[PDB]
A paper describes a structure:
Spy0129 is the only pilus-specific sortase of GAS M1, having been shown by gene knockout to be essential for the polymerization of Spy0128. The overall structure of Spy0129 conforms to the archetypal sortase fold, in which a highly-twisted, 8-stranded β-sheet folds over to generate a core β-barrel, whose surface is decorated with loops and helices.
Spy0129 was crystallized in the space group I4122, with two molecules in the asymmetric unit. Crystals could only be obtained in the presence of 0.2 M Zn2+ and the asymmetric unit was found to contain 19 bound Zn2+ ions, which were used to derive initial phases by single wavelength anomalous diffraction (SAD) methods. The structure was subsequently refined at 2.3 Å resolution (R = 20.4%, Rfree = 26.0%; see Table 1 for full details). The most distinctive features of the Spy0129 structure, however, are the three long connecting loops β2/β3 (residues 86–105), β4/β5 (residues 126–150) and β6/β7 (residues 173–214), which between them shape the presumed substrate-binding region. Distinct differences are seen in the active sites of the two independent Spy0129 molecules in the crystal. Alternative positions of these loops are stabilised by bound zinc ions that coordinate the active site residues in different ways in the two molecules, and by crystal packing. Structural superpositions, however, show that in molecule B of Spy0129 the conformations of β4 and the β4/β5 loop match the equivalent structures of all other sortases, and that His126 superimposes on the catalytic histidine in each case.
Residue numbers in the entry: 52 to 237
Write the structure that this text describes.
């Protein structure tokens, strides 16, 4: 719970930079950003060694969620431990029922994200694991790339100023499989 832990985590590890909540799941966690994307494989939010590691914002993103595309990722262990419910978004009824997640930043800014796709892709997706590549792609290539890999999708109003947030980890039942749940910042 955020009220007991967030400030203290923030005080303990300057890598701590947001809190993530996804209604309909037990995803309700502090988020770190590392200096690279391997740092939190075997490191906890408190900054110590860990067998499961942590969920992390891509090192190339702005902590303020100002970028076009903010990628929140978990490696294999942390994904199984913390993001085990993401594949529920593959289910029609689940996807139609749970439509948002929210983030609170370290300056206590509150963001609401509107979910529009659940994606099945793999570790070698040419677009979605690089926020820089996304930033320099057109909105239409981004949305069509996503569309063709989506198991669930919904059309929502977008502008060219729209920002996106993706949550992702592995899906160990398919080859090099990755799941992505993506939304648009309210
Ligand atoms: Cl990857
Ligand atoms: Cl874009
Ligand atoms: Zn940093
Ligand atoms: Zn539910
Ligand atoms: Zn660090
Ligand atoms: Zn990994
Ligand atoms: Zn895995
Ligand atoms: Zn607060
Ligand atoms: Zn593509
Ligand atoms: Zn709205």
């Amino acid at each position: 719970k955020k009220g007991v832990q967030f400030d203290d985590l923030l005080a303990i590890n300057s890598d701590v930079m947001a809190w993530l909540t996804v209604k309909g799941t037990h995803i309700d966690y502090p988020i770190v950003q590392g200096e690279n994307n391997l740092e939190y494989i075997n490191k906890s939010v408190e900054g110590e060694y860990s067998l499961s590691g942590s969920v992390f914002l891509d090192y190339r993103n702005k902590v303020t969620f100002e970028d076009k595309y903010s990628l929140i990722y978990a490696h294999h262990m942390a994904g199984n431990v913390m993001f085990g419910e993401l594949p529920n978004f593959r289910k029609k009824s689940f996807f139609n029922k749970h439509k948002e997640f929210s983030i609170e930043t370290k300056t206590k800014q509150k963001l609401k994200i509107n979910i529009f796709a659940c994606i099945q892709t793999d570790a070698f997706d040419s677009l979605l694991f690089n926020p820089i590549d996304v930033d320099i792609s057109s909105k239409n290539e981004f949305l069509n790339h996503i569309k063709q890999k989506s198991v669930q999708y919904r059309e929502i109003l977008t502008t060219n100023e729209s920002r996106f947030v993706a949550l992702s980890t592995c899906e160990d039942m398919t080859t090099d499989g990755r799941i992505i749940v993506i939304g648009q910042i309210e």
